[PDB]
């Protein structure tokens, strides 16, 4: 739509400017426009797409959590009926969040994943698919929640299978995937023991491969390993 008249390179340039200006909604719109040009994305471009939408959905998730907590407190025993406004506004934010998730999933399905043949690209996109289904799961209820959870699980599992066959255990995309899948198990799937096992095995297999890395690669891998350890400390 609105970015169809702008050059791909200009969209990428403006995404980078939007990032510097902390204008993440603009950044996401620019990167959506770039994806819709139909060409595969470079590593740097995949990162720009991810940063943009992560910041947009992250603000929405934070807002939804605030409103859901107010709503839950409004619905307790001996709370004053305050009318429909809290629910309405929580629903408004929820619907916007779902729309962002649907937009990202649509870009991945049309046609980023199917055109991604290298492991680094395909795993990145499958991880993203699991992440955006996970964000949908955070706000879902009931049987709808069940199917969304299964979709997140399936995307993460495909990404796991590829990453284990095609990437070293210290690869940051592989590590971040495993981190996020462990969060899925703990926070979404009610499988804390699976979460703990995955985080431990991931950490230990990365530790054993650190000796192969340059200083810069070591910094990235150890940063994610620290997040695995942080979660293990929270979970045990």
């Amino acid at each position: 739509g609105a970015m169809g008249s702008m050059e791909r390179a200009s969209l990428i340039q403006k995404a980078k400017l939007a990032e510097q200006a902390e204008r993440y909604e603009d950044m996401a719109a620019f990167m959506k426009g770039a994806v819709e040009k139909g060409e595969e994305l470079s590593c740097e471009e995949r990162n720009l797409l991810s940063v943009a939408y992560k910041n947009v959905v992250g603000g929405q998730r934070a807002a939804w959590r605030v409103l859901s907590s107010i709503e839950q407190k409004s619905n307790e025993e001996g709370s004053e009926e305050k009318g429909p406004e809290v629910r309405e506004y929580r629903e408004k934010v929820e619907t916007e969040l779902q729309g962002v998730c649907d937009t990202v999933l649509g870009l991945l399905d049309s046609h980023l994943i199917k055109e991604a043949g290298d492991a680094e690209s395909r795993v990145f996109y499958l991880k993203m698919k699991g992440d955006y289904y996970r964000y949908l799961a955070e706000v879902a209820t009931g049987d709808d929640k069940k199917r969304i959870i299964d979709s997140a699980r399936s995307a993460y599992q495909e990404a796991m299978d590829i990453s284990k066959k095609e990437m070293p255990p210290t690869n940051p995309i592989r590590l971040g995937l495993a981190l996020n899948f462990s969060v899925f198990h703990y926070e979404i799937a009610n499988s804390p023991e699976e979460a703990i096992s995955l985080a431990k095995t991931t950490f230990d297999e990365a530790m054993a491969d650190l000796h192969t890395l340059s200083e810069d690669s070591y910094k990235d891998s150890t940063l994610i390993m620290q997040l695995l350890r942080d979660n293990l400390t929270l979970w045990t």
Partner: peptide
């Protein structure tokens, strides 16, 4: 809440 992968 558990920590997921941070942005760049």
């Amino acid at each position: 809440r558990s920590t997921s992968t941070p942005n760049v």
